[PDB]
């Protein structure tokens, strides 16, 4: 019809962590939640950002892919796009959501 005036889903962040047992758990959407030893999945609805820290292990990296693709396929009927980045290669879209990055420790 001519006017759509009655309303009406939110950003989420998942931590992917473990070795023997790799677990995905929801955490606050914030840079403060990120850790260099794990992988994180930032669900923005139409885009999913998959980020692995420099010290993440292979099982976390594999599980992170499974989680990203699971949201894409099971929740977004395959239409959301997945972007893999890592520590230091984050795309501008992540910074728009999460704001300025945590500074690196002096002397890198
Ligand atoms: Ca880890
Ligand atoms: Cl991308």
Numbering used by the authors: 148 to 155, 158 to 257
Question: Anything the authors wrote about it?
Answer:
Gelsolin is a 80 kDa protein displaying six homologous, gelsolin-like, domains (named G1 to G6) existing as two alternative splicing variants: a 24-residue shorter intracellular form and a variant secreted in the bloodstream. Both isoforms bind actin fibrils, severing the filaments and preventing repolymerization. Gelsolin, in particular, hosts eight calcium binding sites: one for each domain and two incomplete sites, which require actin contribution.
Here we report a structural and functional characterization of the isolated G2 domain of the N184K variant. Best diffracting crystals were used to determine N184K structure at 1.05 and 1.7 Å resolution, which will be hereafter referred as the orthorhombic and trigonal forms, respectively. Only few amino acids were not modeled: residues 260–266 at the N-terminus of the orthorhombic crystal form, and residues 256–266, 158–159 and the side chain of 169 in the trigonal crystal. In the wt structure, the C-terminal tail is wrapped around the globular domain and is involved in extensive interactions with loops β2-β3 and β1-β2. More importantly, it provides a sort of lid for the calcium binding site, contributing to the hexacoordination of the ion with the side-chain of D259. In contrast, in the trigonal crystal the C-terminus dissociates from the Ca2+ coordination, assuming a stretched configuration. Such conformational change leaves the calcium ion solvent exposed, with a water molecule taking the place of the carboxylate of D259. Nevertheless, the calcium ion seems to be still firmly bound to the protein, as its B factor is comparable to those of the surrounding atoms. The open conformation of the C-terminus, observed in the trigonal crystal, is likely due to crystal packing: the terminal tail interacts with residues of the N-terminus and of the β3-β4 loop belonging to a symmetric molecule.
